[PDB]
Amino acid sequence: LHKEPATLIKAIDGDTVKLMYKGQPMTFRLLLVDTPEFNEKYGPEASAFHKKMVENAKKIEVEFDKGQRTDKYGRGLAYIYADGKMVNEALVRQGLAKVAYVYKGNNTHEQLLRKAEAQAKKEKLNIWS
């Protein structure tokens, strides 16, 4: 897998973000995670977390997996990095997302993320509190 450039257009919520990729605006859905919706518990906190990570980043990068790159809604499916740190993983690690939506063939970082979830759960963080 390969990291590719992109620039923030705007934060949306816990697990979606508007980025410019190859010069075109796209909504990205984070692979392998599920954040609460803004109106649900920890929804606002997920959104804020993602927002901060991406707004403070100097270098946003997009990493596609081996499978489908767009979902049925036209959202790009990727791992997103903010100054080299994966937002997908950081959400999980903080108990602000659950590992979810693990489809065969777009699941390269599954075990990395499940390790983060296990630590978040041990620490009883946020969702796991």
Ligand SMILES: Cc1cn([C@H]2C[C@H](OP(=O)(O)O)[C@@H](COP(=O)(O)O)O2)c(=O)[nH]c1=O
């Ligand atoms: C994360 C992800 C979601 N989706 C689809 C499955 C879900 O369909 P449904 O809308 O039919 O539930 C929806 C979940 O996204 P959200 O959690 O953003 O709603 O997006 C994929 O198809 N592939 C993926 O990798």
Ligand SMILES: [Ca+2]
């Ligand atoms: Ca969601």
